[model samples]
Every structure is written in C-alpha cells, then in structure tokens.
Target chain A: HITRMRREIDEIPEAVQRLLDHGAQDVARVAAVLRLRDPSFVATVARGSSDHVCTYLSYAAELLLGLPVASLGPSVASVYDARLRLDRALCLAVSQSGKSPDIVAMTRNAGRDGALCVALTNDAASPLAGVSAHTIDIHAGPELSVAATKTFVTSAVAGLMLLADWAEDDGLRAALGNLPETLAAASRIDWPEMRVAIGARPSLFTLGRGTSLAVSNEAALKFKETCQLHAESYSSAEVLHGPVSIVEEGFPVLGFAAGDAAEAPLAEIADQIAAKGATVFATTGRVTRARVLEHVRSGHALTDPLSLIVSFYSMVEAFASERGIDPD
Target chain B: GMTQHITRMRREIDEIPEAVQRLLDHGAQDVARVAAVLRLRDPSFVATVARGSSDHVCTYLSYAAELLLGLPVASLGPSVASVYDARLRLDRALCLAVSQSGKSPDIVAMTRNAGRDGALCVALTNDAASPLAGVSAHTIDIHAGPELSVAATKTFVTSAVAGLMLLADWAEDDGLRAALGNLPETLAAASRIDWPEMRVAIGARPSLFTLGRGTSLAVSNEAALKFKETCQLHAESYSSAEVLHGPVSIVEEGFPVLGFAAGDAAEAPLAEIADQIAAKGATVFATTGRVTRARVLEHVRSGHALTDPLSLIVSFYSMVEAFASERGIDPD
Candidate 1:
C-alpha cells in the first residue's frame, strides 16, 4: 500500500509544475522589487526542511548575483529581542505553515529594520506574508505528510525561480522552465543498490559540496526522520578535517556530486572514503573508484541538484517501506 | 600503551588556561590595534575563513560580533577562492581569518583574495610568520605555546579568547574585557571539573548527539568533532532549536545525548530541549542545572555570558580526553 508520504513524494512533479505555472507571477513581482532595491547583502530565516531550501538558495544568490548571504537565527529576534541595522538588505524567510511565531517575528523585525523582506511559503495569507513586502505562494498543494516532501521541492523551485528571474539569466530560466518534466523523470528513478548497502546500518555519512550540500543536509534529516537511522551530513571540503576518522570497515557513504566545480573534489573524497573499506556511492562519473549511481541531469548545471534530491526522495520512501516503517 | 600514564591530550588540556592567559598578555596590543582599525573603518558586516575547530571559534565570535557590534557575520567558503578562484565582492566587509598553523594553502589563498577584493583582513593564528599572516593587514598571535596533541585544545581556547578580545575591544565593551581578564582562573577551575556520568552514559556508544544554542553551539560542534577524532566515535552537533524537528526521530531508549549550555540567554531554552529529549528515552546530559528531567553535569562559571562558553569547552576537552583514555585509545 502506498503511504501518505509516498503519495506526497510522487506528487512532487506536478507540484513543481504548479509552482512554475502559478507561482511565476508572484516570483516575477518579487524579482522586480529585488532588482529595484538592488540590495548589497542577503539574510535568510528558516527552520527544518525549509532551512535546507535556504541553504540551497544561499549558493544561487551568492554564485549568480554576487550577494553575500547570512542566515539569521529566528531566536535572535524572538528570544533575544535584539534589533539589527539591516537597511538596504534582502531577507528571505521560508516557511510552509508560515505561522511559527519566531519565523514571523524575525521577518517582521527585519522589515521594520529596513530590509526588503520576501517570504516563500505554501500559504499566501500566512502571518509571514502579512508583514513581508512580497510573498511567493509556493503552490505545493496540501502536504499532509509529517515529513515534508512536496513543499520542500516547491519552495526550492520558488526560490530558484526568484533567482532566475531577478538575475535575468536566460540559461537558468530555460532550465527552470523545463524543470517539471525533469522532475517527473527524476521521480521514477530509484537507488535500490543504496538500500542494499544501507540495509540495517545504524549510521552512515552523506556528503556534498557547494550547492548540493543543502540536499545532503535534507537527506540526513530525512534518514533520521523516516528511516530511523543516524545519518550525518558533511561538506566534502571539511569531511577530511575530522569526521572521516570514524569510517570503519563496511561503513556506508553517499556523496551528492552536482555538475559544478565541486564535483571533482567530492568524487576525490568519495574515493578516499571507499579506500578506507567503506562502500561509497556518488552521482558523478568523475569518480573512478567509487560506484556511480544513476542520475538524471536537469537542463542547466545549477538546476541539476534538484533532480538528484527528487530521485533520492523516491528511493528513501521505498527504502522505508521495505524496512517496514511507516514513512508517514 | 596499556600502562596507566598521563596522556598527551590531558596534559595539553591542562595547559589551555595558561595558554589563554598568554594570548591575553602578549596578543592584547595587536588585538587593540586591529580594534582601532575596525573602529575607523566601521565595517557594515563581517566574514570569516577557517575549518574544523578554528571554524568553530569563528562561529562563537560571529555571535559575539552580532551581539556586541550589531554586525552580520557570514562564513565565506575557502574553496570558493582556493578551489574555484571565485572572487567575492567584499568592499564593505571585514574578513576575520583564523588557523592554528596558518599554513593551509586554501586559507592563505582566501585571505589574500579577500584582502585584494577590498576587505579589511585580520588573521588570528599561532604562527605569526605563516603565509596567512603575510596576506592580512593585521595578525594577532594566539601564542598557545605549541599544541602538541593532534586534537586542538589549547590552540582552540587561545584562538577563541584572542578573537573575543578583538570584539570586546572593538565595541569598547569593558564588562566583556574584565570577564575575559579573569578567564585564566575561571578556565582553570573549569579544567578540574569532569563529567564521569556523561562518559559512563556514552560508554562504547558508536554514535551520539551534542546540542547547544547561540554561542554555545560552537563548543558543542567542537566537542562532537573531538569525539570523532579522538575516540573514533561517530558524533554530530545540532542547535537545540533545530534538533527536535527531524534528528530527534533517531533517538531511542538509552541513546546518548550531550548538551553544552553556557550561562547565557540560550541556557534555559537548551534545558527545555534537554528535558524533552530525555523524555524520549534517550540518556540526556546537559551542563545547565535548570533541567529536572535531564541529568545535570557540572559546569564552571566564567562570570559573564559571552565568556561562559570558553570554560564549557575546556571542561569538555578534559572529559573527552579521559573518555578516549578509558577506552584504551590514545588521544594523541
């Protein structure tokens, strides 16, 4: 029987389609404001899966627009009641429910402090949107599952659409325009071999770099949330610094390698961990030693990581069912 | 290897207090000079560059900068410069670069790139002559007196103290400076305290969780990394606010959960989370005495909120080194 989360995972493609079709208008409106304001710095506010979306968007804003991004702890406003001097800045707050008091308080606080506040949330009328200068209604229909899947993808798409529009990048806009179909294809693929490698393993390592590091964090959270496993995510840049010392015999390592400059370095780290007697799987063909998983490429390099996460969602859902745990 | 002898890690942990005093005594002039420059520039925001424990130091200092100076701090990835040579727009930014050895090519490359990209750069390192120092406009020596152990104990403490002094002086915050002046004794008191309950609770556990909030999260991150490096134990750190959302689903009966809570605004909130996690059947231990459900481990008082996390980490360093030794694993 398909679970609620399984259905939600399957609905990701149409959710992306809805976001592309209906959400583009809101994104375009916000993108126009972004260009008008022309902020020099960026700050983000989020929690849980929504926070991972911010992490993904952090790279896009910095890499594409040359704006340095900082994430503000919601408690900084809610708990500490500290007011910041945030004039001429852009603060993007992502929330599905958008009713969390802390998230709402911080957004209102940033706006009051002169930031151009923009919110990406599933509900257009949430308290978060009430105080923001603009809001992108992430058109992901009701995500009933406790573990967020559809909203995660739609919110990510919403942020990307804003970036693609604000930067006026023809390449990224083209990729995002063709994104729903690629996500449809990504939703059908599975990594059964990873399930086999991860069978009953109490712990493992998920690795990524650059843009894909956000997905690594989401995957680790999902593994703990649904799979009842302790999965820790690390940046391939710093995994060799300390975390790799725990890679004993037959440990499982999953590396998310996007089609970016970080691919080769991530592949190198994957091979090194594999050499330490751990089974390693990566999505890039740059890995000469580690096993390469099947990956569907999005039309653009920046959009490729979206497909990886969608494929991962399908596999993780099925893996949970095989383990006899209700993913919902 | 089986003999009962003092480990190098324990000896180094014992030196952390004096090492911090050495930084305060010798590193003050340079810190004040940089603070003077910072007041002149009045940077709109801040950026940091480091890895591992040094990166954790940056995390702690980032909160202090935001709290004291009202400056937003962001961590610029060194790979952006060293790996991709992606130059950033930092014309209105102040870059604080940190490293113990100051020899990592990536760190030096990023520091040089940030300086050339129009950032007022500062380097905090034990080696004043290293390449990272060469690229910076100001260099503050941690003067940790040669950290012999592979794990960074004294160097980490000294680096954090050095960076905090920079923030304190820049903001002209005398309360924070006076608290820092008293760290040598307070941290020494912290060094003698141990959490045998946590060690026994975490006995032979392959994986565990450490949690903190605000500035204390830096010490939590450092403690988790040390467990991985020294004890060969798999550990991960999370914010008390962030851990309950999804990561808590992994906790089972008797699973180990250690929390680092300094005497700050975040301590009470961290205590509430500790209680909630303990109720989930995990063996939870926290430094805050406020938790009734979760067991309280002894933590030393450092007199001020901002200076409190320093003492917390020193206590952890000693406990973790002993944890490794009790397991017959050499900490060095």
Candidate 2:
C-alpha cells in the first residue's frame, strides 16, 4: 500500500496549484488590506510546521519590504491569559488544523487588540478563519499524513503570494506562478545518494540562512518526527557561535541554500564544516569542498527555497521507508 | 603556574552572586529612570535586540513582560539591520538591547537603527562608554565590574538581573520588586547548592536536554549554551510543551534531561513533562518536587517565580564549573 506520507509528498505540486488557482482572490484581498493598513511591523502566531512558515515569511517580508516580523508565543494568551497592545500592526497566523486552541485564542486576541489579523490555513471554514480580518485558504486538500508535507509547502507559498501582492513584486508573483511545474520536477529528483551517505548516522545538523533557515528548521523537525533522528537546525551565521563544538569527523551536515544572497554564506559554512571532516551536503554549487545537492532555482530570490523543501520532503520519505520506518 | 590555572570562568562564576547584588544596588536608579520613560512612552509592543547569552536575557524579559505587564515582546534579529541593512517600523515600540561589551557591530547597528526609527531604546550593558551606549536613549550599566571571562558569567547574570529589575519597576509589581531586593541573599545561598548527585548522573554523558517553560525557558537556553561552551556537551533546550512534538523522539534509555521549574503557572507543566520523559526511561532531574518519575534536584526557592529562575542558574553555574573541571577542561 502506498503510504499517505508518500502520496502527500507527490501531491505537493498539485496542491500548490490548487492554492494558486483558488486561493488567489483571498490572497489578493488580504494583500489589499495589508497595503492599506501598511503595518509598521508584523507579528506571527503558530506552532510546529505552521510556525516554520511564519519564519520563512518573516525573512521574506523583512528582506523584500523592510518590514520587521516577530513571532508571538501562543502561551501568552492561551496559557498566561495576557493581552497585547497590537495597534497599527499585522498579525499573520498560519495553521493547518485551525483547531489548536492556543492558536485560535491568539488569533482572536490579535484581532481584538486592534491589529489587522490574517490567517492562512487549509480550512476555510475553520474557527481561525472566522476571527481574522482576512483568510487565505491554502487549498491543500485534506492532508491525511501525520507529518505535514503539502500543507507546509502550500502555506509557505500562500504567505509568499500574499507578500508578493503586498509588495507589488511582479518578479516573485511570476516565480510563484511557475512553481507548480518546478515543484513537480523537484519531487522526481531522488536523493538516494544521501540515503546511502547518511546510512545509520544518528545525528546531524541542518543549516540555512534567511528564509531558507525556516526550511532548515522544518527539515530538522521532520527528521525527528518521521525518521527518529536527532537533527538540529541553525542559521549559517549563528551555528559557529557555539553549536559547532559537537561536529566531529564523519558527522553529517545538510545545508539548504537558495539562489539568494544568503546562498554563498550558507555554502561557505558547508565548506568549512566539510573541511572539518564532516560529510557536508549543500544545495549550492559555490562550495568547493562540500558536495552539491541537486536544487531547482525558481528564478526569484524569495521563492527559490520552496522547491528545495519539496526536494527534501521526497528525500526524507524515501530515507525513512528504506530504514523500515513507516513515515505515515 | 598553578596560580594561573584558576580560569577566568571560575572566578566569574564565583562573582555572579556579588555581581548581581551590585547590579541591584547601583543599577536601581537607571532601571527606575528607564521604567519611568517606558511608562511615559506607553509602547504598544516590545522588541528585543540581542544575541548569545544576552539573547537569553531578552527571552527571560520577554516572558516576564508578557506575564506581568500584558505586553508582547519580539526578538529582532540583529542581522536584519546589520547584514541585510533593513529598516524596521518601530515607531511607538520599546526596544531593549542587551550586551556585555556593547561593542558588537550587529548589536550597535540594530540599536542605532531602532532609535533612529523612533523606538524608545534602552540598552543593558556593562560598558557605559561602549558604542551601544552611544546609540541608545538610555543605557543601564549592568554594574558587573570587569568580567575577565570570555564566556560571560558575571555579565550574563547581571544583565538578566538588570532586565528583571527594569521589568519589575515598569510593571510596578510590588511582589517582584520585593523579591528583587531579597535576591542577593537568595543567590548567595543558591551558589552553595551542591548537586554532587548531578555530577554522577551526567557522568560522561555526551548530550542532554535542558527543559523549561515561560520565564524559565530562558534559563534552559542559557544552560544549554553554557553546557556546549564549557563542557563541550550537546545540550538542546526545549520549551517543556514543545519538546513532545518531535524532539522527544531522540530521548532513549539513560539519556540525561534537566528540567528547570519556576514556582509559577508553568511549573506543573514542566514537572509533568519531566515525569513523562523519565517514565520513558531517561534519567531526568527536575527542580520541582512534584515530579514522580524524575529525581528531584534540590534548588533555592526565591519566593517569586520570576526570580526563582535566577537562583536556579546560580546553582547550575556552580555545578557546571565543577563538571568542566572534572572533565579536565578549563572552565574559561
């Protein structure tokens, strides 16, 4: 039987296409509201994979539009019962289930506190959609897999699309418009070589920069979730601060580099780690020592990292299955 | 030659109790002044600019602010302004930047940018004359004196004390302020807590989990960072609630886990997680006696949950300093 995990991984491109076709009006509407509000800053709310989407969107918003974004811990409302003064701000909440009580409470509190609230979720009729000023349904059909694959990709794309419209970036919009085909091709690119390379490695590090750091975090979480591996994610800039002490010879390090300004720095870190005798793999060709992993460039700085994640999802599924672990 | 063997880290760790007291003694006027400014400005939100140990201080302050003042705190990436040259719309927000030297270029850049962007900027630093002080509207000297250690022991403790004091005064929480006045004595007592059992439990353990929730989460992050820096141990910090998501999968029989619990709403949740992890066969140590499965690590009680985390760190520093020495590594 085809595992639901594998099925969801294969459905990523089509799911994202569904989001692009059917979710555009909601995205455009939220974009219009955001442009009008012209929020001084953006605060995000979510947990798990949805929170990773917020991290990715945060970097994109800051790098592209010079708007600083911050993530709000949901406990402030749900656990601590605190109210924040969020006037003249935007709260972007992303969730797949839209049923997490903590997330719902936070989104409700954000809207009540005068911030323009927006939610991106797979469920249009979910409670989170009712509380926010705007909702962007990702259109990723019911994800049956316990490990989120298509929802993660589509939610990230939803945020990117909303950002593209808000920033009036024609380049990013065009890049995102062409992502379905790119992502389909990314799914077919098997990383069996990495499965061989990592054969029984118990621990590793995932490195990225800017928006790709979010993808790195998602990958690290999935590694632990599905493959029962101990993987830590770090920013290429911050990893060497103190976390590098554990990297010994034969250690595995994966670098998720996009074709953006951060690509060179990430690849440089990969090179340095490889020089330390670790098996380093990066998605950029800029590295001299680290092995280059196959990557697709979506032709935009903001959207390039999304395809890397699709490729990673495909690789991790195969690796988990080969290890006799049921990814689903 | 033997005299030189007394590492800077050891001396600084010893100085933490006194350093924090000194901060509470002399830093009050500055803390109160900033607190007054904060009240006047009435920021809608708070943004923190920091990295490393200073970042952990910000995390503590973030949780305290949310729990006490009902204000949200966001950590701004210093690289946003320094590396990306990005601008933030911080016009009506309050920005807190913490650093020991206050000389890091990224920190200075972010603080300068925040002040330029019209955020009420307050800096917590040991160096009153540093460039970070030059950019902020208000600078609260941590009063830690000269910290010779490269790993930042005294300065870290003082910075956290400074932040907590400022938060206490700003919120006008009498309970917390009274707790702060008593911390010097509490912390001194905390430094004397001998966890020889933890030494045996962590014997040769290459990795561990440091767990906490709410304000104590900052303590967990700092502990993890220190373990990596001093003992070369891989210690990952997790919010007690978030660990069960995926990170808990790595815990196996005999895996070491340390849980820091503050006497607050989060204490029970943290203890619950500790008990669950211990039930899974990991060797777990927690501060709260409420855990049934984990061994109870004795700790100093500071009366207030906000200040309890500070005492726990003092005890850990003492323990970790000894652990580093036993492992034949220089604590500095």
Candidate 3:
C-alpha cells in the first residue's frame, strides 16, 4: 500500500512537469500577443468545467495583473443584460473541446463588436480554435474523458503561464518547473477512507478567500461532476457570515489553506466549524502542512500558488475514485 | 429519494419547537403588516429583488403578488443573463427587496437607483438597522437573528413570511389573519423528530419540481431553491395554472413535485396539477391546512391573502425540517 501510494505521489510531480511544459508554451504565446496589442481589457468565456478555469484566470489577469476582465453573460456577468463597452478588449475563449454553442456564440459576439479574440483549446483545429486570431494548443494531448481531471490542472497551468509571460515574471516560470514535483508529493493521500467518510453525507462545502475563491469553486464543481455530490464553494468570509447558520452536524466542510498567512485564518475557520460540532478537512502544501494534515504529499514544497494546486488536483482525483467514479 | 428525505426532515422538524414557535410569531406580524399596507399607494407596480436563494424567493413573489393583489410584478438582479440582455424594467416599479442582510451592494444599489427614480421601496431584512432598511421607504424587519451558515435556511422561511405579510395586508384576507396568528405553534410542533431513517433512505438523487397555488406558489419556489442550493439538485417551481402552459418535458420522471396547496381560490387547480404530474411519473408531496395524503398541517385555514402566505411559509418550514433529516443535510 505504501509503495503504491508512493508511486502515485511520484506521478503527481511527473504530471505537473508535463503540464508546466505545455503551459509555458501557451503562456509564451499569450505574452507575445500581450506585448504587441497590450489590450486594455480581457474577457473570458467558458462553460461548465472550462468555465471554472476561466473564472480563475479572470481574477488573476485582472486583479493580480492589473487588467480589466469581465464575463460575457449579461445576467451572470453583467449588471443586468446591459452590454459593456468592449471595443478595446481582447476575448479569451477557453474550452477543452472548443465546442459548446454558447462559447462559440460569445467568441463570435466579441469578434462582431470589433474586439480581438483568441481561443485556448486542446483541439487546435476545432471550430472554436479555427475562428480565433491565435490558438495556443494546450498539448496535454487527447483527454477523452467525461469529467476533466489532468486537463483542468494543465489548463490552469497554461493560463497562468500565459499571465506569467505577459507580466515577465521569472518566479512563476521557475515555479512551473517545480510544480510536478510538488504534485507528486501530494499524491500520497488516503482517499478510500475519505470516500467512506463523506459518501453518505447529503451536502458538502468548500471555503477559500481572495485568489483561492476560484480554487474553492473549481473544487466544488469537481466534487459535483465526478463524485455526484452536491457541494457549495464559498468565500471564507461569506461562509462565516451567513452559511454557517446551517452547520450543526453531519456537515462535511472542506478547507483549501495555502500559503503561511492564509494558514492561520483557515485554521481558525476549521476550529470554529469544529466547535459547531461538524467535521472539517483542510488541504495544505508541505510548507503549509505544518498547520494542516497534507492529505497526502502529492507535490513538492514550492512556495507559490502553483504548489498548492497539486494537492487540490490530487484530492479531486482521489475523491472521484472513492465515489466509484472515473477520474477523467 | 426526495420522499425519504422529506419524511426524515418532517420528523426532525418536530424537535425544534422553539424555533417553530418563533416562525409562527414572526409570520403573524408579517401578515398584519401586509394587511395594513396593501393599498397604501396607487398608480404603481411591484417588483422583487433578491440574491442567491432569495432570488428564487423573488421569482415566486413576483408571480404570487401579481395574482393575489391583481398587480403586475417583475424581478431584477445583477446576474449574467440579466446583464447579457437589458430585460430589467426598473422604471416605475416598486422595489420590494428581499434579503437576510439588506447589505449586498448590488441590492442596495438597485434600491438606491429605484428610490432615485421616485419608485416606492419596501425592504425586507433580518437586521432592522441594516443599510437596506435605511434606504427603503418601508421595511419588514424579518428579525431571524444571526444566520451563522453560508447557505441560507431559516431566513428563507422568514422572507416568504414577510412577503406574505405584504401580500395579505394588501388583499386583507380574514382567513389569512387567523392562519398567520397561529403559525408559530404549528412550526414549533413540526421541528421535533429524529431523522436517522430518512437520511439513510435518500442515497443519491437529483432534481425536483415545486408546484403551488396563488400566494403559496411563492413558498413552493423558495422550497425549490433550498433543494437546489442545499442538495445540488435542479429544482423549478410552477403555479398550478402556469404548468398547464408547456413545461411537461422538464418535469422529472418519478421526481418529487412538492406542492403548496394552501387555502387559495386556485387550490383545486394546484391539486389537479399535482395529480397530472403524478400521472406523468412524478411523486407528489402536497402540503395544506386540511386532509392532505402526502403531507398535511391543519393550523391556519384563513383565506385572507395576508394570512395565507404566513400559513404557507410555516407549512414549508415544516417541509424543510422534514427535508433536512431525510436528506441527512443541515437546514442549508
């Protein structure tokens, strides 16, 4: 059992390396474009799993990178069906398959309004990628599965790589190299027990703050899609503010605690929830694991947001398998 | 799976008699307020505002208020679809903001915009001293106290109660007054059961459809939101007559369709819809004040619009308590 777990842990870092190579390629291309156009705004359009990735990038590009980002859906992304002024923006339509009619329509809409559009898709020759000015192939290769597993991690890496190249950040580039090692370290978790623990629970929740909000949402989405579980992901503050009212017992609360400063608050969140007589699970990197349990060191101890994601991917995969579901 | 959870939740709901009592008391005040201010203004229309779970509350409220008060109503928000298209008609629309916090910037902004346009504003919030309360011309203080969880549970109940208060007072239904007066006891009695059996029964299931009549139709919608937000289930609510339109295919096969068959002119229509949905392979869980085979609570049978909403709210709270135990989930 230990040997098998170790092999799986090793595979995590291996997988991370592959994702970083592909991500770096994609990021370099986006950075080149950013240098040329220096677009004023960036609009990301995606649906379902791909949509989760877009949400992460949307916040990263706009908030961290100082670019204005917005989604196309008027109601979900808009103030109320009113169109935003997007003449000077660039649209990044992300899709694993580069399908979904809504995504196609959004891309077309952006193009029609005289905005530059690019497509990030694994299928470089697919219609979605075919319509864009530039299509940076994910090259994670044929991921023929129902629920996105590696593709998600790879896509996130690729998106960040694009951002890193645009911002000319060497730290992110170096961190990318060490991501797979971190992931391999994370793969050592014991999830069969976790499956037994959480399977029967009717509801689950995920909590994160700031940049981690996107991760919380992605984690929640994966739990629902792969495990057939109903999980809600909320901002840490939002969870404390209102949703905590329902946390009595049999409520499985999942915490994503990355970085040192975030660790303390996350620990407080778990302790407070535990005080409410509920079960709490906190995922942390090797560095952050001193505060958390390190579910299973699936990745290396890189001190960046990139390292924490390895644990996230490992946990999601384990969760899917424990449910007697595929980790595709 | 839905039935199993509902039965279990019904059992646990019996344990929290105190909370149930509070629900009834709060519901009665809501009805009285509705009765007093039903026709306070003229030459104006009504609109509902909410975020997350209360958004469904707004949808149900719009449908119910329009029917009960014979007034046109609509709902608006800052969601993707709303912004994708400019469908929000805020002009001359009396904004009835439903929120537990009365503090969401979006809701506050919408209310402020409406107030600036000279539209009458009614804010419903648990915190009477909230910014939303200060912004609106009139307020229905829900007083649900501190909601600790991120997902809304009891506040949803109070939102429905408050809406009923606004509606019943507008229509001035005498039966509604009687029902609203006794809702606290009914809710308290319903919250005291052990829910182990019910939780074990519903292993894994998805989707639900809520059906209702008149004012209670709004209550049904709020219930659907709870099912969705809590269970990751797809739930949609329709009025008895509204279902007669063209949504048959969307109704789940052998899926649970919870109906709020409260005392309304259209109760028979709601019953008929439940029957037809059952015939089409959907399980029917109907709640009412009299002999309802699926689920019945004989507390308030008042036909007054003000009080009917209050009764429906309590009945749904009972159903929520039942749902929690059966599904093995918290009130969220």
Top-TM-score candidate index:
1
* TM per candidate: 0.95, 0.92, 0.54
Q: Write the per-residue lDDT of candidate 3 for residues B178-230, one digit (tens) a residue.
A: 65556555555433322222223223335566776655655676666655555
User: What tens digits encode model 1's per-residue C-alpha lDDT throughout B4-112?
Assistant: 6988889898888788888888888989999999999989999899987899999988888878877878787776677667657788899999999899998899899
| Whole-model lDDT values for every prediction | 0.85, 0.84, 0.57
TM-score of chain B of each: 0.96, 0.95, 0.70
Ranking by lDDT: 1, 2, 3
Comparison by lDDT, 1 against 3, better one: 1
C-alpha DockQ for predicted model 3:
0.02
Q: Which CAPRI quality tier does the interface of model 1 achieve?
A: medium
Model 1 alpha-carbon drift over 4 Å, by segment:
A144-147, A200-202, A244-249, A275-277, B1-4, B204-207, B250-253, B278-282
Query: Per-residue lDDT of A248-281 in model 3, one digit per residue for the tens?
Result: 4476777776553445566677667767766666
Could you tell which candidate, 2 or 3, scores higher by lDDT?
A: 2
